[PDB]
């Protein structure tokens, strides 16, 4: 339904304070603000400096010297008109914090102050979160206090399912091979279970998953004796959890890990980070200076002593990791956009949990590094000079990577497909990276979509002032406002990336590129771009999100699988039969209601208009149309009804109600009675077949009323009785007056008794008598509450739900299901984009060790972070010549004839071409009959295509992909690559 | 999931002529490998046994992650086929993966003809006829077979 409300709408209790407004602070604050909260208050009195601009995207060079908190407030306020953003004048004593519900301490707050603030917040009942980033390293800490309760651990919809058989002992088996989807320890309640009476009262039962299609409950002989049927519903029971203070946790930390392969490092960095503060204490507030071995070894000593002070952090016999801590010291001053964005999303989500009560908080420490982003030191040496500052905004990126690698980032040539949420966060990361900022680099962003608001000013590059303009253009200009070094380097196109645009995005375009990044949702665009990147052998950076879940995938030429090779299966489609007659879920009734909307208010009007304007309409429709009867019946009914007053629109809606929720249902029960037995001998209405009861119209039932209201209004639109103008807050009296005086025809079960088409056409009126008559078809606009569309779908679905005893759904939930609205939240978007930009570094160094790359998955509900080595491309072999099934191909010069191609493959490779196709067109087959084969075998590919498609090549083409099947030297079938014909 | 749609289609077409299924033909359009013309013989010892039935088959953008689309062209009296050619088929709906192929869909349709299922009906009238008036419904299926389907060799 909605995202999260009712008892979980505590975010309008919640005032958030963020201390420190460098890159980490702004990333966090931006995400929170976009999400929505009662208030955001920020605090950073320190003056802006050039270096700060490494990741702090809201700061400009005009601001240098001013307070960060002052110069960021206005820009954060822009983000959400419903969220007030303040600045804490001063933080002089801890009690000033009592006015806030969550306090966040970022990298600008000393550990001494973090311990003080946290002791105060914990003992005072205030939620505390802290976060820090140190080059390619980072951490976060959560402390929501003594008695936090998890009421919605995962946020996902409660699992439900239909029961087939339950014994005296537990063992609940499902219906017709269905997953329950439950894990061990879950709890479930039951409904509609016949026999076991009080087993349906709401009592919970612990679930032992003994199979993927069954589970155990216990003894159920006391509730009754199972008869038939039933449904189970998961319920999430509360979980009480305790957080320890920061001081308790410093010596006894509880970790949430970020990477399977790096479990140990978390205990090391936990010490390291501490030592960093200990270092700053001794060195007048400074961190270890960059790539400096003196400070590095001082840090190793500080950690080595801290180990003895905190033996439980490493345990017994575990040594300190010199090299890890050494790198921590080397990178202490670093400010890396990817790491900062990652922790921004992660930490912002933790803040939102602390505000809302939703999901499962992090408990309590998490550490993270991305050291494999480091280039080959051979390629790019790292020492105190190469890494030294240069009086630029990129100085704290140079601190980690060195000036030469950073220059290579500047001189990269990159293609970004899509300027949506992820696309915008990507352009932001790239702006902060100075990517494509050198003289030999550039960026190309392309999106043919327009801007339109979501809910409470989502999207941190688009504003109300921007509605209607292109996404790519506005995003490019916004990030140029953040970093002028990219002014005139962003090529913002508005083209679609597919077959229809291959002369814009051509050989030259693609071969110039260093790599590609995809920021698009739909599977078609994604597979196309992926196959382009396979063709041109380019690296591709893929990402996706689904609410609190997200993933990143790297596609490396000659090395890894492609995106299409591993893409997920699309969503289940509703079986036609269940849809038409046997719904058991609100999804079915919603889909059926949508169909009915289409037919009532869009299709019928279009058909009437065609019949009135076109002169051969009837003749043509007879010639070429599958559903002739449907079209003509639609027209004739539309024209035989003819409402002259809104009174008649109300009457029409009421009669449609009777037809669909009384008569049609009675006809269905006529065909198959409630106790009708199948030929099998069992009941017809078993399992997912719920026997309906016909409805009796009741104007005080909300769904009946709103069906009549919405249908009458939309028909009034069709027949011009009211345009987009009607006081749409109706009274039952107005409609009840009309409806009580109607005669409702009784149910006539039509068992009463070329040929029918001629009667239809005889019925149709003469258009000359309908002179100047037009129907205005509706267009389904879901994001407009005035128009009655969602009202109609909700009420229609809910009346059908009443028929089959399916529980109703409100407008917002119906809108969610009917729109297939996929959630997009700021936290996950920023986080996943950060991880992509961390793998980008590996592309810059042209890495070819597959162990260096990281495919990522996250679920911020749990929270879970996981990374996995990309999958190697599958490889084969046909004549002892081994090959790469994804990336390898055959290459052929010139517009060769088909016979020469076949002969060339028999000679050079030993292959017997059995099939050959170009795109969708089959050009040659082994089983083709003689007459067919002769006309083709002697043709050039271009003319071969002209023959099959009867359309010549556009001429802008220089290359051609051809798929083939073939046998080997033995005559048996072997798998083989594709062929590139270069014209 | 396969890296290329037309490659998959080629692989299936070659094997359809190489190793055909009895009583079924399936051949694509040269200028569109995504459209298949199909015919199925009525199974022996069924109402449809003297007829040959025409079907269109289509492969969507995301095949083989997505099941084929199928529609009867021959008018047919069947509990699970409606007037516009639409079919309720257990393979089409819930059970689909890259592992299944056009072959399996055609086998399933052939079997639906052999063994109709009015218990899970699409054409509700024909289902009523089949449950209450089985022998008569079967006889109407025979009549329609010779009336509308093409005859066997
Ligand atoms: Cl510090
Ligand atoms: Cl229990
Ligand atoms: Cl939340
Ligand atoms: Cl630079």
From Swiss-Prot, chain A:
Keywords, alphabetical: Acetylation, ATP-binding, Cytoplasm, Isopeptide bond, Ligase, Magnesium, Metal-binding, Nucleotide-binding, Nucleus, Phosphoprotein, Repeat, Ubl conjugation, Ubl conjugation pathway
PTM comment: The N-terminus is blocked.
Residue spans of the Sequence repeats: 4-141, 402-556
Active-site residues from the entry: 577
Recorded catalytic activity of this chain's protein: ATP + ubiquitin + [E1 ubiquitin-activating enzyme]-L-cysteine = AMP + diphosphate + S-ubiquitinyl-[E1 ubiquitin-activating enzyme]-L-cysteine
InterPro entries: E1_4HB, E1_FCCH, E1_FCCH_sf, ThiF/MoeB/HesA, ThiF_NAD_FAD-bd, Ub-activating_enz_E1_C, Ub-E1_IAD_1, UBA_E1_C_sf
Effect of residue 963 to K: Strongly reduces formation of the thioester intermediate with ubiquitin
Effect after changing residue 873 to P: Strongly reduces formation of the thioester intermediate with ubiquitin
Impact upon substituting residue 521 to A: Impairs ATPase activity
Pfam families linked to this entry: E1_4HB, E1_FCCH, E1_UFD, ThiF, UBA_E1_SCCH
Crosslinked positions (Glycyl lysine isopeptide (Lys-Gly) (interchain with G-Cter in ubiquitin)): 572, 585
Note: There are two active sites within the E1 molecule, allowing it to accommodate two ubiquitin moieties at a time, with a new ubiquitin forming an adenylate intermediate as the previous one is transferred to the thiol site.
Protein name, as recorded: Ubiquitin-activating enzyme E1 1
The species this protein was found in: Saccharomyces cerevisiae (strain ATCC 204508 / S288c)
Name of encoding gene: UBA1
Swiss-Prot record, chain B:
Domain of life according to the entry: Eukaryota
Keyword Transferase: yes
GO BP: free ubiquitin chain polymerization; postreplication repair; protein K63-linked ubiquitination; protein polyubiquitination; protein targeting to vacuolar membrane
All copies of domain UBC core, residue ranges: 4-150
GO CC annotations on file: cytoplasm; cytosol; fungal-type vacuole membrane; nucleus; ubiquitin conjugating enzyme complex
Any one GO molecular function term: ATP binding
Recorded consequence of changing residue 111 to R: Lowers rate of ubiquitin chain elongation. No effect on thioester formation at the active site
Pathway annotation from the record: Protein modification; protein ubiquitination
Keywords attached to this entry: ATP-binding, Isopeptide bond, Nucleotide-binding, Transferase, Ubl conjugation, Ubl conjugation pathway
Note: Present with 8970 molecules/cell in log phase SD medium.
PANTHER family: UBIQUITIN-CONJUGATING ENZYME E2 (PTHR24068)
Stated name of the protein: Ubiquitin-conjugating enzyme E2 13
